[PDB]
Amino acid sequence: NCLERTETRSSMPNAFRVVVVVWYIVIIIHWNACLYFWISEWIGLGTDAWVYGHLNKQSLPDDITDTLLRRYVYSFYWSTLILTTIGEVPSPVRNIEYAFVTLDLMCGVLIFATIVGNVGSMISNMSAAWTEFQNKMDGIKQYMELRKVSKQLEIRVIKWFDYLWTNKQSLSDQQVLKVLPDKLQAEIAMQVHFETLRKVRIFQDCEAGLLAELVLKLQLQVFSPGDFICKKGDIGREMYIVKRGRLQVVDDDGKKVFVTLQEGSVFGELSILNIAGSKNGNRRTANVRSVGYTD
Amino acid sequence: YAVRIRKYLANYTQDPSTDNFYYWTCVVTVAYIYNLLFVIARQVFNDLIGPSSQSLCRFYNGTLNSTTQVECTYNMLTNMKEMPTYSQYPDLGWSKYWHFRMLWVFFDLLMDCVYLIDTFLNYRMGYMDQGLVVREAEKVTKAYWQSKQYRIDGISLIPLDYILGWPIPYINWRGLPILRLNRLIRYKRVRNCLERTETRSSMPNAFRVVVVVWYIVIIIHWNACLYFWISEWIGLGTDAWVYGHLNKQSLPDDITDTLLRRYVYSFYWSTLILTTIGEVPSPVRNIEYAFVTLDLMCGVLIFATIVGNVGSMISNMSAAWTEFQNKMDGIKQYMELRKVSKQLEIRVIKWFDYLWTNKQSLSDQQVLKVLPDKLQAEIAMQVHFETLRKVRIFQDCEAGLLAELVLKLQLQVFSPGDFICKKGDIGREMYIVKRGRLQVVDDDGKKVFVTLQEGSVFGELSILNIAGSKNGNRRTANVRSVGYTDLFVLSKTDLWNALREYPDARKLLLAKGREILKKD
Amino acid sequence: NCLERTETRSSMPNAFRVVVVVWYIVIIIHWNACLYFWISEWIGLGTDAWVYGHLNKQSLPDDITDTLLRRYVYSFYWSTLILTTIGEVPSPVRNIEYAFVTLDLMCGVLIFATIVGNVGSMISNMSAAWTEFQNKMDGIKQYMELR
Ligand SMILES: Nc1nc2c(ncn2[C@@H]2O[C@@H]3COP(=O)(O)O[C@H]3[C@H]2O)c(=O)[nH]1
Ligand SMILES: Nc1nc2c(ncn2[C@@H]2O[C@@H]3COP(=O)(O)O[C@H]3[C@H]2O)c(=O)[nH]1
């Protein structure tokens, strides 16, 4: 329960996981070192070439003193070679040493395969976001290589992915969306976007229940520079609140700018609000265009 | 031109999103790889700048019949009974290895000039403010001073190796080339260069295996330098684990002790230890046991991580074929369990052969659940431009209808002889021909009225609501695929959404539908 | 395209996959056997204890005749121990043999890790339905044991 509560509370969880599995490895090799030296001193030291002693010649070579440190150091090395199944140790002689080495090598195979599979998974999940990102971009790039898509649009997609990795604006709200409760989700989302949603006039000139209702139905979408978010011929099913970026309300020539849109601006609502006073209705009434990258 | 260079560098400001900056990050990656490999190699294998000491082998002379401590030949470094002693040069080898040392200090000054241009570009680095880079000098210099990048660049450019990293003969300073690990501190530019190179690459898995082969070579090289540093710190030839004459794997019979032999045996020892093959001599002293136990466990953990990443990388080179064959294994096991007819089994197998031969699998899931709908619609109108230029409901009307409907079209592949529509069935969909040829036939299947080619529109009579004829929701004709046919399927709901929003396409569709219904 | 169309049309797909990867293994060990014996005869046979010859004593022990079958059999065994990184072969002597054995052992590590990972996935997917079934039943049984 202490290790589970420490992995829960940790700000560095994968570092704690590799420290715990290194401790597990050291405890297992230490216990097998003690088993090897107990079987060596139970058989009798120096009685054959597998047991620790003078006949071993890996344990006690020339100009090497038999000390307690030498006993623990050779037993830890023997267990490191046996449990990792390198096996560069002397062969067993008696049948009880064959039985112990066969059982201990198969225990080493099974539990060290389990352990380093967990280690490989742990240092694989230190880069799971970059792996999922590059699997998505490999899918997009293979689709664009198969379908003979234009090179301008290919470098537009590649620069969009470069902006999403450089600014870390990938869709990370799936985690809070399918794990956390909506009272904690709304509190986190009003915590993060507080400086953005403090600039919104439909939220700050009205009741807080509207923002508490709408803050989970807002989706973050990243647009390229020069992208037309709205133009007059298109129909509108959505409104947009500016999280980041600068926009410009332009004409059909794209030169004359009427008004710019900064962070916290509200646009795109004229198409989805139903006013019978003008000729458009569901149509967009203006051409907005992203200056840079725009969330 | 001094005022030209001076004022150009005075209000220069770097855009980090350019391709030229990415090539500069590749140059900084080259300088970092230099610093990594050759700084640990010049610290450990100190004959890389010149030996700086005279090797003195004992030699039984054939003329004077006595042993002398003369300088070693390559014949005297072969089959040694003891390792040579190293008498120090008076000038520390500067009189005869100055060309090697000036080549090394030229490449050191070259990579330090690369680091100086890199920290000047850091000093004038533009930064995103509202999706645009700031590119006047005052804001980018104050953002540089606010961000402690001056601390990271100033630790990384301390020239301590230019005073203490070279053999000085006057104070008999041996040299310390390990003082460029501060140049190894600048890892973040290298990591961003590798991430931007994997982003921009047309061959991503080849770049991934090249990067992990470079990681493997750097790790085995650093462990080679650790093994030879521990071998020369214990003392060479003192036992059978350390490099030397007592090892007999390092120096066998008729093998000369050279610097190439030292690096080659250390690289081989680290290759066998980190991959845990272990066909190397056993340790003798307790410090060698501790180093080999720690280094073998580091080899187990980090090489298990590395080759697991390698196996995943060369597994994802065929992930589409693996997913395809997992789906077909599911279909084949379902058909083997359920005793389905052999004609229908070979029809399903030939359908899968057509989807792999023509690569018409559902690949729009990727753009569907990653990309924005403005980029999705631009890609889909880029790919199917020659098909949707032939469509009369799209090219005789407004472009907003095609921009609305181009994401609601689904590609479905039909077998030859398949009946896409026949008169008894009800219709919930319309079809636009992406590829293939079709035929409007009778109930006998022999008499053909009209053929349908690429860009033809059919299937709309059932889902358009005309009260002028007896059918209504029924199909009015029997269409039949001649060969394999890709079709742009569109639902009744999505069509009637785009037709309630766009009235002129509704007028043309109901006009030509009532025209073909009233001659029919 | 023949191997892809054969894996498509097969009623036993996993048996065909393990036959194809056993053929891949045999072709790779055969090509490395030919590389080892070409480097052995280019260095010169019997010149040291790593090269095939009389000084090797694993290649030509006592009462073992030097034949063409012995050359191919020892080269196939050497490549089987090197590519699977068991390594119970004589150590290199000259620097070119160290370079070849280091490169060939790292090629063995990478491409045989790829190959047996594919083999383990192939004989894991022979029982994927029973594994998914027992993962579902383990979930139901753990929910019923907890509740
Ligand atoms: N027509 C018009 N639209 C504006 C102006 N300023 C901001 N907009 C916004 O631009 C949006 C474009 O799409 P909508 O027509 O849905 O809604 C429009 C308004 O929200 C303006 O001055 N004139
Ligand atoms: N009835 C009829 N249908 C045709 C003819 N030419 C093309 N079709 C198409 O065949 C389609 C079959 O399904 P639908 O009845 O939905 O719509 C029909 C028309 O779209 C024709 O000449 N007569």
Author numbering:
A (entry chain D): 292 to 586
B (entry chain A): 101 to 620
C (entry chain B): 292 to 438
Wording from the paper:
CNG channels open when bound with cGMP and conduct Na+ and Ca2+ ions into photoreceptor cells. The gating ring transmits cGMP binding/unbinding-triggered conformational changes in the CNBD to the TMD, where a cavity gate formed by two hydrophobic residues in S6 opens and closes. Cryo-EM structures of the Caenorhabditis elegans TAX-4 CNG channel carrying the analogous mutation, R421W, show that most apo channels are open. R421W disrupts this interaction, destabilizes the closed state, and stabilizes the open state.
